[PDB]
């Protein structure tokens, strides 16, 4: 019940997801995905994952810049659609909002199995760690272990990135 | 009265701010714009008075009509005058913009830009010297020092 900050952030996450899933326009969809990336960074930050949250926010900012350029080039029309400019987009948006609100009320006032399992709430502070040790960040040590433990992961990842460059060059060649 | 004193002081402050920060459009037509550039040149340095050219009409406060206005050009001049946010001022520079000048009797020339837009100051000459245009700009500043907007609003 403590300030409900994580619950509010996750609700805004879901709202941004509904925003871009209704597919109003690519320009608007990218804005919704940016908002979702920001609140997800916040959610991960509130759990001790500063590096991962900042990293995912930076990555999605770059991706959405490329997507904005591509939308201006290849996904435009005379009247771009907003969430209130079309009955289909508005209906999908309102349906998503109402589904989210219904699920929140359903799981908050009752203690019911939606699909997988049940949940009573209490705020996500309960399952925390009360761990008292360290001159280092455990997340940072785990991520840095990629260069000593994750040799195989580094190999496959680097190979896949090089292959991706070659692949995009082959795909866009045309002829 | 207290209200009269307050509105007079506020009017003074607003007028000072407006006249000390006068941004003309980057806009010239003919011979007179060369003298405009010489007014922007180091010897006269209009920027030292707070006068800075800006290209966009939405960021401009004054329009200097510097050169002949032809019939083909008049709709464009009117259009960029309409797109200036208010308050806005127009300065007519040179004989051509004043009343047509050397081309007053031509078939393709507007006989003075004041047929198309309202004009605040007329600068005579063909072309007026950069010093004369500076005098006209300072005269426009002195005219802006004299307006009573808040006092007239209070008197309503």
């Amino acid at each position: 019940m403590t300030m409900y900050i994580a619950f509010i952030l996750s609700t805004i996450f879901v709202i941004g997801f509904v925003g871009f899933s209704s597919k109003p326009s690519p320009i608007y969809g990218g804005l919704g995905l940016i908002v979702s990336g920001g609140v997800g960074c916040g959610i991960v930050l509130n759990f001790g994952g500063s590096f991962l949250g900042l990293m995912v926010f930076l990555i999605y900012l770059g991706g959405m810049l490329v997507v904005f350029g591509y939308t201006t080039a290849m996904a435009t029309e005379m009247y771009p659609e907003v969430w209130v400019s079309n009955k289909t987009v508005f209906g999908a948006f309102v349906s998503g909002l109402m589904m989210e609100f219904c699920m929140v009320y359903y799981a908050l006032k009752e203690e019911e199995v939606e699909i997988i399992f049940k949940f009573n709430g209490l705020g996500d502070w309960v399952i925390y760690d009360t761990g008292d040790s360290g001159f280092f960040s455990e997340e940072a040590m785990g991520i840095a272990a990629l260069y000593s433990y994750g040799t195989w992961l580094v190999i496959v990842t680097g190979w896949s990135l090089l292959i991706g460059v070659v692949v995009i060059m082959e795909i866009t060649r045309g002829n | 009265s207290r209200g009269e004193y307050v509105v007079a002081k506020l009017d003074d402050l607003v007028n000072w701010a407006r006249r000390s920060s006068l941004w003309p459009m980057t806009f010239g037509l003919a011979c007179c714009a060369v003298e405009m550039m010489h007014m922007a040149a180091p010897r006269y340095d209009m920027d030292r008075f707070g006068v800075v050219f800006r290209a966009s009409p939405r960021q401009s406060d004054v329009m200097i009509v510097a050169g002949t206005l032809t019939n083909k050009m008049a709709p464009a001049l009117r259009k960029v005058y309409d797109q200036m946010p208010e308050p806005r001022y127009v300065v007519s520079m040179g004989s051509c913009a004043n009343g047509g000048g050397y081309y007053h009797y031509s078939y393709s020339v507007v006989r003075g830009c004041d047929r198309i837009v309202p004009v605040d100051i007329y600068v005579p000459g063909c072309p007026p010297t950069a010093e004369a245009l500076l005098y006209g700009i300072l005269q426009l500043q002195r005219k802006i020092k004299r307006e009573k907007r808040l006092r007239i609003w209070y008197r309503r």
Binding site: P26, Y70, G174 | -
Partner: protein, 98 residues
């Protein structure tokens, strides 16, 4: 599970549903794909942080890498489709039938 887990899973389901129902633009479906990737990143990060699994802190980075590869692939295909038709509408991809 807490409420945050249900919220993240709901976000994943919404993005999947978004991908499944196509409107006109291909780019919107690509955005839904990226949204699913982001939801999976958030869920995995929360699970790994909660259980203090130190060596698993590096998996979401790998997930992001392959998400970038997938997005690049989709964007290249979109470039080709648009060059063919002058539009990224999924209605134009109807030359092959069942």
């Amino acid at each position: 599970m807490p409420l945050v887990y249900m919220n993240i899973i709901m976000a994943f389901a919404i993005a999947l549903a978004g991908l499944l129902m196509y409107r006109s633009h291909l780019m919107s479906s690509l955005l839904c794909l990226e949204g699913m990737m982001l939801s999976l990143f958030i869920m995995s990060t929360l699970i790994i942080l909660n259980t203090h699994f130190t060596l698993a802190n590096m998996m979401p980075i790998i997930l992001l890498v392959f998400a970038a590869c997938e997005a690049a692939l989709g964007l290249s295909l979109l470039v080709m489709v648009s060059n063919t038709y002058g539009t990224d509408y999924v209605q134009n991809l109807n030359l092959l039938q069942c």
